[PDB]
Amino acid sequence: VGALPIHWGAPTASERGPVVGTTTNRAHRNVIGTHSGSYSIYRALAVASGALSRHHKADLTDTAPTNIIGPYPQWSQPGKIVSLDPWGATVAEVFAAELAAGHDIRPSIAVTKAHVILPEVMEAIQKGRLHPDGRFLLPSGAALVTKAAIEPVWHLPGVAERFHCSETDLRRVLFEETGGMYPELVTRSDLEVFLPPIGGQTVYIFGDARDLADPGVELTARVHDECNGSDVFGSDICTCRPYLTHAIEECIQGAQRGGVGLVAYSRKEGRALGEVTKFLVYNARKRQVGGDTADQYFARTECVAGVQDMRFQEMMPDVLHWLGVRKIHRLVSMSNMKYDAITGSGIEVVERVDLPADLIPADARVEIDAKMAAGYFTPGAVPDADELAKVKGRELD
Amino acid sequence: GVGALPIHWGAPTASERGPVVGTTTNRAHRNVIGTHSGSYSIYRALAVASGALSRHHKADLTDTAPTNIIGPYPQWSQPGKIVSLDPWGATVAEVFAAELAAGHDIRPSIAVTKAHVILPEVMEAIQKGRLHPDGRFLLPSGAALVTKAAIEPVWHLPGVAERFHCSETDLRRVLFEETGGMYPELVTRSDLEVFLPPIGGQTVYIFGDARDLADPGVELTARVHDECNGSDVFGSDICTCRPYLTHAIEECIQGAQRGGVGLVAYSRKEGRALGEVTKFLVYNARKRQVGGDTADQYFARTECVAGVQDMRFQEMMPDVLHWLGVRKIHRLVSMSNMKYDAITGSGIEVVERVDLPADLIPADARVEIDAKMAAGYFTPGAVPDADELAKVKGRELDG
Ligand SMILES: O=c1ccn([C@H]2C[C@H](O)[C@@H](COP(=O)(O)OP(=O)(O)OP(=O)(O)O)O2)c(=O)[nH]1
Ligand SMILES: O=c1ccn([C@H]2C[C@H](O)[C@@H](COP(=O)(O)OP(=O)(O)OP(=O)(O)O)O2)c(=O)[nH]1
Ligand SMILES: [Zn+2]
Ligand SMILES: [Zn+2]
């Protein structure tokens, strides 16, 4: 009849206990916050307008994962996974008794399958770079994938340790810097788990999810942070979608050669500054005295945002650990921030696959040159001060 | 010091309206619930906790101003017309220059810039002769020249409540309860009317001249598209989303080329605003149910998981149109009766409705679009019957 305890990192589901973040019975709630990231606000609108009963509980029939992921040892190693719930995809199975007992437990992960058709993959086929095999890649250009949507679930003591500050400071600052969101951050130190109203990520798996846990199977992977204006709209000011679709191409070939491929797509728009800040910086970049130069790229963000980047890649490897990933043979990525995080978490990276020069869009030179000067991996020449001062950016029109 | 500046929502001028002060550098100046950047205030907090970002930092807005002048328009002050974004949010540096100088730390909630967008479907449209570069709107590279505006949410709680035909205090209590107590000020600070929710906003892509949006004598082609990452980015063939998005973009480019103007609004409402986890759960149940993935079961599968078919509440979606001065949409590249009802209900005339051509429906999206048509989505001709909707049109899992 009371709220179930949570022992983060315990080796069984029973011992770990379920994340109860629903609101149908507040005496059962054992976390701060609520499911579905931002979309709790829309659920509130649906309740307030009469469309949805505040008493509704999901019918989870037939929703269970299409592919079995874990459990793996990483799920129970202390401090290893702190920003998602390793049991979040299998709650209907591992918490069946708690559900029947009356605890309204929602999945925070869902696993299904798809056929993804990307125009860049269809072109890769037309140009003889890819050849359909009928298993991973079809003649239509469709790739067969497993995909997993993963919503955030933060163990605040683990997150604090991840960031080298005390938990009470992390929680106080979370409370203050959001204008006082969730006073239980400072008022309920007994609650260790937080469901923030932020986007999560989506994992695309090419081949067998279980091979992600076998470091003897060659793994091609990219962690991609959302860039809507490119990932969807193809703006030529940045490398994002070209890098994403190049990685997808490489992942398909990886699977075809008998390995496995992984793309994680994490919702951190604009370096987790959001899109308004991102567009303000573009304007400042193009209007500054001297033109849009690579040697001012980072400074223009700094002046608006007070920081260069807020993605905190130190939590990004949790999804890899959830998947059992223990080694990445081909990391399709250049960022030294991502590379240090992944390898700093124990995961070997064998080959770093930089973005081929011919995929850089017409107004993305400023970005990629600044990034290589800042330490992003490249096999070739790093731009020196003189090359960074070239006005490589297009004028405002 | 000075107290918090009052806010008179929908006042005739920026000065009378008052700035949205949602920063945290000075708590005494805050005059709203919440903070800027939607979801991304959580990351800002992390940056401050880690010591990477000073809690005293304030934006240098030098050179950030809109690339295109949007408004002001009468709709910015019509009662209850715009309740989910701040019409002054793009121009705070100009219209609240005084208050900034009096020490009120005021951030934009809107940014307006320009871009060259290069979509593969547009390149292919050129190869097939559906589109022809003109050098001004569409380049031979396939790049289209656009103005784009990122709009983050700013809610006037009394106006939002009215829009939903419920009392303001009921709306605010339910927002508080159903989020697990997100912002107690919702129930504790009835004097604060304005709420900055931690949700995504939208991005408007304008083909041609933004000022023409306010001129109903200029032919407007428009789509309001709700985010579907798994299609809009990854092209899953279960749904129509990216085909509809890129079809609309093609139509907007052409509209601008003929002397008109185009608009695509891209709103962050993943999975009918249920989010992506619920969306994937429903796909699984669709494909495993007795009798297979059929269109007459499509909406039932969502209701069983989510308790509703849809949470996007299109009732707030026309606000951006009114912000842009749109009074008439000559070609609405959309089918949803929910969107159409909200748009016309809000006073915007719609002339032609442009359905998704049959040949752009992906291989496993037949279930979706048939169910939508049978549910009342616009279609130029016949709607499917009880039979037809009962055909197992959906691919099996793995499949
Ligand atoms: O000028 C820019 C440059 C980058 N981004 C954002 C988008 C996202 O937050 C990330 C997109 O790409 P990716 O996910 O692949 O990250 P990265 O740091 O560029 O590393 P790499 O591509 O080497 O993996 O950068 C901007 O908003 N404005
Ligand atoms: O099976 C589905 C069907 C739809 N969506 C969501 C995604 C988003 O919430 C919207 C996709 O794009 P759009 O913005 O164009 O909405 P629509 O209702 O289909 O109306 P129309 O396309 O006719 O304008 O529907 C799902 O999550 N699963
Ligand atoms: Zn980008
Ligand atoms: Zn879709």
Side-chain angles (χ1 to χ4, degrees), chain B residues 222-375:
Chain B
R223 175 166 175 70
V224 175
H225 187 86
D226 290 316
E227 177 174 13
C228 168
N229 187 72
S231 172
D232 298 345
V233 174
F234 285 94
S236 162
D237 74 342
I238 206 172
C239 62
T240 52
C241 302
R242 191 175 164 99
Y244 220 165
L245 171 62
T246 62
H247 183 62
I249 290 174
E250 289 180 28
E251 296 303 298
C252 288
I253 289 159
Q254 278 186 263
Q257 282 179 319
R258 304 182 298 267
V261 66
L263 170 74
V264 176
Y266 187 94
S267 183
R268 306 315 206 277
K269 295 186 184 183
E270 175 66 55
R272 304 175 145 110
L274 308 168
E276 213 179 35
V277 160
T278 302
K279 181 183 194 151
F280 289 7
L281 296 175
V282 169
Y283 289 155
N284 283 347
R286 276 179 47 195
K287 303 289 194 189
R288 289 182 180 133
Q289 74 195 303
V290 179
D293 190 18
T294 65
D296 53 31
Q297 282 319 295
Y298 169 90
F299 282 114
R301 289 286 68 71
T302 288
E303 296 171 330
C304 286
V305 178
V308 288
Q309 307 186 353
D310 195 299
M311 298 192 171
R312 290 179 279 177
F313 303 118
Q314 303 302 343
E315 293 96 327
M316 281 188 290
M317 168 273 291
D319 280 17
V320 76
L321 303 179
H322 292 290
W323 179 66
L324 296 158
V326 172
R327 269 138 63 211
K328 184 170 176 182
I329 294 167
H330 303 73
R331 314 191 70 223
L332 177 58
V333 182
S334 167
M335 276 150 88
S336 175
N337 55 307
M338 280 169 297
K339 288 177 196 168
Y340 173 87
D341 287 347
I343 291 166
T344 55
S346 88
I348 296 170
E349 184 183 355
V350 173
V351 185
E352 194 217 4
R353 302 170 79 173
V354 188
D355 59 308
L356 178 59
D359 70 303
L360 291 181
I361 294 129
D364 198 24
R366 207 56 235 176
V367 167
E368 168 223 334
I369 197 69
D370 279 359
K372 282 170 171 175
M373 292 186 284

Side-chain angles (χ1 to χ4, degrees), chain A residues 222 225 271 278 297 311 333-335 338 371 376:
Chain A
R222 173 173 176 64
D225 294 318
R271 293 158 154 130
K278 187 183 186 156
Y297 173 81
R311 295 183 266 173
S333 178
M334 284 151 75
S335 165
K338 292 177 197 168
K371 282 177 174 171
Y376 278 42

Side-chain angles (χ1 to χ4, degrees), chain B residues 124-167:
Chain B
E124 186 175 312
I126 293 170
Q127 276 144 194
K128 297 293 191 323
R130 289 194 315 269
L131 291 180
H132 305 273
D134 59 298
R136 200 194 137 162
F137 301 103
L138 178 62
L139 304 196
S141 64
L145 275 64
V146 299
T147 298
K148 61 183 184 180
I151 300 154
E152 278 161 4
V154 179
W155 286 11
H156 185 235
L157 293 168
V160 174
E162 192 163 57
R163 197 65 74 74
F164 281 97
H165 308 304
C166 67
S167 82

